[PDB]
Design a protein around this ligand. Structure first.
Ligand SMILES: O=P(O)(O)OC[C@H]1O[C@](O)(COP(=O)(O)O)[C@@H](O)[C@@H]1O
Ligand SMILES: O=P(O)(O)OC[C@H]1O[C@](O)(COP(=O)(O)O)[C@@H](O)[C@@H]1O
Lengths: 463, 517, 515, 513
C-alpha cells in the first residue's frame, strides 16, 4: 500500500510505527508550507522561478538586513516570478509575502563589556550565534552580530518597516521578540487601518515569551518557534520542549504554527543535508507544525533550490506517516462543542472524508475561514480552496494541507451556476495537477447564499 | 443536566457509570421499538387504540395459534385503530404488522375431556409419552401424547424431555415397543397442547411445513410488513421463507428467529441473508442450558450491531405482568440491559396477548427504554463503530456518517431524511445518532418497515408531487419540520441536519445541510 | 477455547461481545458469592447440607420475622450442616452468617382468623385504614390494620398507600380521628403481616428491637450485619454503637432502600464495609424504571472504592413456585455479575419456595458463565487509571500480583492472610485467576466471602517451630486444596503472596511458581 | 512539578504535549546510554577520564581504520581511565567496549591534499593495481575490483559521505568512465556507495574474521556488525566469534535497503540493532531514513532488544562548541522515539569538542526522558506484548507495575548475565533499574539497556546463600543512597530468585528505605 495506510490502521501508536514502510511511496500533495527567506542567493527572478517550482509558498523578507529600496525589489521580484505562471489558471501557485520584523536586536562594534573590548546602553554574555561566551570586567568560550543576554519591541524603525509592508501589500508579518500580548497590539496599531488584512505571526524567542505564551497565542494569528534566539536565551537542551509544547497548544487552538531556523544549515554549504537535519524536518511535521522554514539555506548559500526541494521531499513522507487515527479522535474529544454552522459542516465534511478515503475536500471560501475550519481537524484528503480573493488565496498557506486556487472568471448571472463553475473549476484543477483521478470520491463544502460567514452544506460527489 | 449528559461526558466507562443520575430526567423520543403480540387481551380496536398511544409500534401475529380467519381480524383491527389517528398527518403513527411464523413446534395432546382440564404431574412418577393416534386426547397424569412421532427413535435412555415452557420436566428411563417410560424430574400442572423440547436431541422437522407456506401466503395476501421466522437454523432456511413469500412479496423484511444451538452455531451465515434477527430466549433457553442464553443474546446483539441490521430481544421481559400490575425487579432490569446491550426492539408476548395488563405492559417498556437510552454511553459507542466499521465508498454511508458526526457537534435535535425505501434512514441509525432520525417518505410500507430501526421515526407524506422536483423536496423537508415541531422533537432555535439527494429515486442520497429552526 | 478467552482478547468492547461463545465452557471457580436466606424451606440440617454443596456461602437471617429463639436454631443449624464437612480440611467450606436487621418496616395485621387466608381488595371500593389495636386481628375486605401508629399524622389526603410489595394500592382521600378512608386504586388478593410502603410520605432507623437484635447477633457470633433502611452515615454509627465493644469484628453492610439513601450514598459508602442494593423497597420508594440506574451507579462507585457490593431481591422469584427461572430472571443474574456485584442473593427463593436447592444451583451456574464474560481488559485498565497512587506495600504487591497473573494466565493467586485484608486488595483489581486465601482465622476465612473471587481455606495445623517452614506448609496447603477441587492442574503457573515477618499488615512479596 | 509529571498525567497525547514545561527540571538518572567513538581526539587517558565523568558508557572502536596495535592501546587506555575510579565501589562506573566491524567497504585510494572533482567533468574510475595512487581530478581508484562489472551503464556512484556523485556513462576495457554529477573536494581512502547495484562483496572478509579474533582475545563486550543484510550474516559473525566468546552481544548494523527489507529475520537472531543513518542515508533516499529509524526503533521496542540510533547527531560540534538546533532536536527524538543508546562519531574521535559532545547528549537525553509519556507507553506494550509463561518475564512486568503504583525510586535486581535486568527495562519503568552482578562483563553489556545501572559486586560469597543475596541487595541500596538514586522514606522494589544461578528469577518484594 501507499501513504503508510497499513501503518495508518494500526491499533496503537507502537504497532503504527512498527508498520511504517520505506517502500510505501507517498501519494499526496505535501501539506506543510515552505517559507524561504529571500537573499542574494535567491533574489533574481529566474532563481525565484525555480524555487516556486520546487515548492516555495511563502517568501520571507528579513528586515534585520537591507534598505527599504532593497526589499522593494524583492517583493517586486517575487511577484514577477509568480505571475510568470499566470500562464494557466489551473496551475498558478499564489505565493505569500511575509515581512520579518527586525525588532530589538543587539549588535556590536565594527573582557570588558562597555579582541578584549566591546549597542544596547543599559546592558550596563554571548556574541555571534552563541558560539562566543563572556561572564560579568568579565570570557568563557572562544572563537574568531547578534548579542543575546539570557529594549522596546517596537522601535521607530520597526514602525517605519511595517508602514513599508502595508504600503507594499505584504501578506503576513512575522513579529520579532514578541514577549507579551501588549506587544502584538503594538504591531497591529503600527500596521494601521489600511492593514487589518495582514496576519500577525508572533515570534517566540525567549523565556518571557515562552512563559506568557498563552496570552500571546490568543491575540495572534499564529506563532513562530524561533529556535535561533530561543536556543540561546534558554538552555539549548530545553528548546525541544518549547517547540513541542507550542506546536501542541497551537494545534489545539486552531492556529498556524511555524518551526524555524537551522533545519537544513549544512546545505548553506553543501549539496546534502546531515542526518540530523533531515530528521529535524520530519519531526517538525510529525510534531504538528503548520509550516517549516529556511534561512541561510535560501538566502546565502550555494544551494537555495536544492534546500527547497528537500523540505518538500521530507515533508511528503513525514505527512504520509501522521497517525491521524489517534489524532482526529483526540481533537473531537478536546474540541469544545460548537453551534456555528461552519464548524459543524467542516467536522462533518472531515468525518465524511475519512469514511471513503476521499481524495480531497473542495471548499468555496471568500476569506478562507472555512478552509481553515476544515484543516483544524487535519483531514488527510487535500483541502482545495476555490476563492476570488488572491489575498485570502495566499494567506491560506498558513494552514496545513489547504491548496488555494485563485478563481478569475467574472460572476455568472445565476448564483447557482457560478458556485457550480467554481466547484468544477476545483475538480478540473484537481485532475490536472493529480490530486484526483476518475472514480475518486470528493467532498464539496459550500453555502446557502452569497458572502462570507454562511458555509453550511456538504456533498459527496464521484469523479 | 438531562439525558445523562454528565455521564455522557465521562472519560471512561467506569466514570460514566459513576455519573448516572436518577434525577437526570430523559428528554428524547424513546428509540427502541416495541413489538406487542395481539391476542384476546388486545384484539379489540379500543384496546388497540390505547396500546398505540402507549407506544406500540409493531403488532405481532403468532401463527402458532388461531385460524387465518382469526388473524385476518387482527390485521383488520390494527389497521383500524391505526387510521383512527389519520386525523392529523403530524401525529399519525404508522404501525408495522409482523407475522410470526409457527414453525416446526412439538405441542402435546389435549388432556382427558379437557381442552380446559388440568392434570397434575407428580415428581417421582412414571410417565408414558406415546405417539398413538389413540392417546391424542387420552391424556392423563401417567400418560401424555406428543404431535411429534419420531421422538421415540430420538430420545435415548437417560435423556430429558421438557413439557410446557421447560417448567415440567421428564427423563427417558426406558425406550421400548410404544411408549418411552420416563421419571418426572419435574412437577406441576400440565395443559392441553403445550410445548415440547428435546435438548441434546436432534430434531428433523422441516423448517417450512405446508402450513408455514400457507401462512406466508396469507401474510403476503394481507400486506404484513415483516416475517419473524421461527426455528431458522441455517441460511437455506431463509431462502425457503423468501421462496414461499413469492414474487408478490420481496418487499417484506425477513427476521430470522434464533431458537437453538445449531442456529446459534451457524449464526453468521444466518445473519448475512436476513434483514435482522430475533433472539428467541423462549426456546433457545430450553434448547441450551439456561445459563448460556445471556451469552447468545449479548453476542448476537453485538454482531448484529456491527452488521447494521435490526435485532430483537424477546420473551418473558415482563411476565409477571401477565398477572400483576407491576414488574419484578428482574424484569424491569432485563429490559434496560436489552436496550443498553444494543437491542433494536424489545417485545411482549403473554404480557400483551393474554394478561390482565396489556396497556400497562407497553407503558413500561416505554418508560424503561427511555432511561436506558438516555443512559447510553454514545461516546465510547460511536467511537467503537467508526473503528470497527470498514471503509466504504457508497455516497449514502458516507453522508450518514457525516450527518451523524455533524449532529454530535451541535446537539442537533433531529436528522431529517428523505427516503424512498428507508435504506438511508437505516444508514443513519447504524451509528446511533442521539438526535432523532425523522424519515419523510411516500411509501407507507417503507414508513412502517422503518420501525425495525433504532430511533427512526417515519412520517408518511401524502401530497401529490409538485411540478418542480426542488420545490417538492423542500415541501417534504419542511413537512418533517412542521411534524417535528408539532409532536415536540424540535423547538425554534434548534439546529437540524437534513439529508437528501441530487436526483429523484432510490440509491442516490448524497447531501447534508445544517439548518436552524 | 475456554473461559471466553478469544472474547477476552478483543480490541474493543464490541468485538468482545461479537466473540462470546456459548460452547466455551467456563473453567473457573465461580467467584460471586451466594447469600441464601434461611427460612422454613431451608431450616433443616439436611437441606442445609444440600444448599452448601450447591454453592451457598452466606446464610441470611431475616429479623423482619421470627423470634430470637427461632433464629438461634437457625444459626445452630447452619453451623451443624457446616461442620458436617469438617471431615477433610481440604474441602471444608466456611459459611458466613449474616443478620438482616428488621429496621423501620411497616406491616399490616393478621387476618380475621387468617394466618393463611385472604381478603380480596376490589378496585374502586372503600378501605378503612386503621390504627386501633382492637382491630389488629380484625382484617376484612374493608379494613386493613397497620402497625405504624404515626401513619395517621404522616400520610396526607391525596396520598398513596402501597400494600404487599407495592402490588395493592390505596389513595388517601380523608384523614379520620381514628383512621384513613381510602379508595382502592389497585386491587388484589391481600394476605397477613405484609409490608407497607408510604412513599413521598419518623420511624428511627434503630428501634429498641433493632438494638435487641444486634445484641443477639453479637451474642451468637454472626459475621455480618446487613443494615435495613440506612439513610445517612450517622445511621451506621448507630448500628456500630449498638453492636458494641464485643463486636468491632462484625462487617456492616449498609442497605440502600430509598431515595435519601441513594442521594447520600457517598457518605454512606464511606463509613460501611459494603452496600446492598435493596431493589425491593428501593423499587417502590422510587420509580421502578429508575432502580437499574441506582444499581448500576452503586455497583460502580463500590467497585471503585474497593468495597463488596450486594445485588438483592427477586433475582429468581418464579422459582419460589417453579423448577426453572424466567428468561428475565436468568438474565437478571448475569448482569448483576457483569455489572460488578460482589455477591448476589436469594430470599423467597430459599426461605419459602418449593425449590431452595435448585435456586442456589442456578445462581451458581449462571454466575460461572457470567464471570467468564467480564471484559477485564477495559476493566483492569480503568482501575489502575482511577485508582490513586499508593505507598502501602500491600496494595503495591497486590496490584503486582495481579498484573503478573494476567501476563501468564495464572490459574490462581494464593495468599496467606490473617484478617483477609490482603486477600481483599487482590480482588479490588478483579484478577481473573482465583484468589485462594489460606488463613487460621475461621472468622476472616468467612468474612472473606464478601469479596469477589476470594476462596477462603481455613488452615487448622498447629504452627511449626520455624516460621519459614510454616509459611511453606500454608502455601502448599493452598496448592493441594487447589488441585483437589480443580482450580489448578499440573503445568499451570501460580502467583503466591506473603510476608516478611509474622502478623497482620506486613504482606510484601510476590512469587511465581509452576505447578 | 519536576520530571514533567503534570504532562505525565495528561489524558491524551495532545494534552500531554500541551503540558510540557521548560522550567520543570528533570530529576532522574539519564537512562539513554552514550556510545562515544575513540579516536585521536579521545585516546589519551586523561581525556578518557573526562569523557567518563561526562557520561560516556560505551566506547567504540571503529575497525574501519587503524591497525590492531592501535586499537590494542585504545582498550588499554579505556580500561585504565576506567579503573582510575575503582577508588570507591559506590561510584565506579563500568564501561563497555564495543568493536565496530569494518565490513565490506569500498574506499578510494591515496592522492593532506585534495584533488577537486568538478561537475560535468569526466571521471575515470579504476581498479588498476598501478594507478593505486595515480588518481586525480580525472581518475579515482577504488579497492573493489568488481565495481566495474556491477555498476551498469547509467548507475549512480557516490563517493565520500554521498557528497561526490558519479553516473557511469561508459564502461570501456579498463574501467568506469563516469560524469561527475555532483562535484567536490575529494580526499583519500574515502567511502564509496553503489546504491541499486548488487554488491557481491562478502559481509565477512578475512580481515573481519581477523578483527573479531582480536576482539575476543581482548575481551570487548559488544560487536557492532557492519552491513548486516540477512540473518545468515550474523551467524557468520557469531561463528567467527568462536567458542571463547558466546559471551559477546552482537548488534546488527542496518545500513541498506535489503537489510531494511529483511529487518525481521535480522532482529530475531541479534542482540540488538543499530540504525546506521550514515550509509543507510545514501543507500536509500535521504527522505526515507526517518521511517527506517522510526520503524526499527518501534519493532525493537516490542521485541525487548536494545536499539541504537547512529551518526551525525551532533556533527557541527566536530568543529563547533555548540550544536545546531537541528542536532539538539535530533537527539531528543531519538530518545522520545525509543532508542536504547545514542552515539557519537566525528564528534568524539576527531573534533575539537569531545567532552562537550558527550556533556550535551547527556543533558538533552535527561530532558527527553523526563518528558516520556510512559502512560500511553507502558500501556501500549502490555497490550502489544504477547502473553508469556517465563517466570522472569512475569516477575519483571510485575516489578514494573509495582513501581508505578508507588513511584518507586528504583528496582534492584540481582542478575548474573543481566537477562533479567533486561526484562525489567523492556517495559521502561521510570524507576531506575539497579543491577547487582559479579560478572564485570554482564555489568558492562548491561549498558546497552535503557535505565539499567550496573553495580559490580566484588566480595567473595558468604557461606549461606540467603545471607549473600542480602548483602548483594543492601549493597545496591548503599550504592543507591551514596550516588543519590534513593533517599530514606523511598520505597524500592527488589527482584531476586529462589536458587543460585542464571535463569531462575521469580520473586518481587517491596521494601521501604
Ligand atoms: O470566507 P468564508 O468564511 O470561507 O465564507 C465562505 C463563503 O463562500 C461562499 O460559499 C460563496 O460566497 P460568494 O458567493 O460571496 O463568493 C459562501 O456561501 C460562504 O459564506
Ligand atoms: O430510499 P433511499 O435509498 O433512502 O433513497 C432516498 C431518496 O430520496 C430522495 O431524497 C428523494 O427521492 P424522490 O424524489 O424519488 O422521492 C432522493 O434524492 C434519494 O435517492
Amino acid at each position: 500500500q501507499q501513504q503508510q495506510l497499513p501503518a495508518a490502521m494500526a491499533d496503537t501508536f507502537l504497532e503504527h510505527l512498527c508498520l511504517l514502510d520505506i517502500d510505501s511511496e507517498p501519494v499526496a500533495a505535501r501539506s506543510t508550507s515552505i517559507i524561504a527567506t529571500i537573499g542574494p542567493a535567491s533574489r533574481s527572478v529566474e532563481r525565484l522561478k525555480e524555487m516556486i517550482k520546487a515548492g516555495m509558498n511563502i517568501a520571507r523578507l528579513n528586515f534585520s538586513h537591507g534598505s527599504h529600496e532593497y526589499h522593494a525589489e524583492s517583493i517586486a521580484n517575487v511577484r514577477e516570478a509568480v505571475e510568470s505562471f499566470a500562464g494557466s489558471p489551473l496551475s498558478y501557485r499564489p505565493v505569500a509575502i511575509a515581512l520579518d520584523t527586525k525588532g530589538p536586536e543587539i549588535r556590536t562594534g565594527i573582557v570588558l563589556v562597555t579582541a578584549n573590548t566591546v549597542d544596547y546602553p543599559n546592558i550596563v554574555i554571548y556574541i555571534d550565534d552563541g558560539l562566543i561566551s563572556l561572564v560579568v570586567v568579565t570570557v568563557e568560550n572562544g572563537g574568531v552580530k547578534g548579542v543575546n543576554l539570557p529594549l522596546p519591541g517596537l522601535s521607530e524603525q520597526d514602525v517605519r518597516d511595517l508602514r513599508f509592508g502595508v504600503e507594499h501589500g505584504v501578506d503576513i508579518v512575522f513579529a520579532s521578540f514578541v514577549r507579551k500580548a501588549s506587544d502584538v497590539a503594538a504591531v497591529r496599531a503600527a500596521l494601521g487601518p489600511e492593514g487589518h488584512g495582514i496576519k500577525i505571526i508572533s515570534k517566540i524567542e525567549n523565556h518571557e515569551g515562552v512563559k506568557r505564551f498563552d496570552e500571546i497565542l490568543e491575540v495572534s494569528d499564529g506563532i513562530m518557534v524561533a529556535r535561533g534566539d530561543l536556543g540561546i536565551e534558554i538552555p539549548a537542551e530545553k528548546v525541544f520542549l518549547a517547540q513541542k509544547m507550542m506546536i501542541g497548544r497551537c494545534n489545539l487552538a486552531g492556529k498556524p504554527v511555524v518551526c524555524a531556523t537551522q533545519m537544513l544549515e549544512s546545505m548553506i554549504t553543501k549539496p546534502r543535508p546531515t542526518r540530523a537535519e533531515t530528521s529535524d524536518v520530519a519531526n517538525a511535521v510529525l510534531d504538528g507544525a503548520d509550516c517549516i522554514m529556511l534561512s541561510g539555506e535560501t538566502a546565502k548559500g550555494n544551494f537555495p533550490v536544492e534546500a527547497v526541494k528537500m523540505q518538500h521531499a521530507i515533508a511528503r513522507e513525514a505527512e504520509a506517516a501522521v497517525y491521524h487515527r489517534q489524532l482526529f479522535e483526540e481533537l473531537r474529544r478536546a474540541a469544545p462543542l460548537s453551534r456555528d454552522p461552519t464548524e459543524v459542516t467542516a467536522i462533518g465534511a472531515v468525518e465524511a472524508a475519512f469514511k471513503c478515503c476521499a481524495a480531497a475536500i473542495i471548499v468555496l471560501t471568500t476569506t478562507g475561514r472555512s478552509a481553515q475550519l476544515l484543516s483544524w481537524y487535519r483531514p488527510r484528503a487535500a483541502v482545495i480552496a476555490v476563492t476570488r480573493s488572491a489575498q485570502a488565496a495566499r494567506q491560506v498557506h498558513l494552514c496545513r494541507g489547504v491548496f488555494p486556487l485563485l478563481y478569475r472568471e467574472p460572476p455568472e448571472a445565476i448564483w447557482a451556476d457560478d458556485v457550480d463553475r467554481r466547484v468544477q473549476f476545483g475538480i478540473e484543477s484537481g485532475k490536472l495537477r493529480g490530486f484526483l483521478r476518475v472514480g475518486d470520491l470528493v467532498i464539496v463544502v459550500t453555502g446557502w447564499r452569497p458572502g462570507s460567514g454562511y458555509t453550511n452544506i456538504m456533498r459527496v460527489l464521484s469523479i
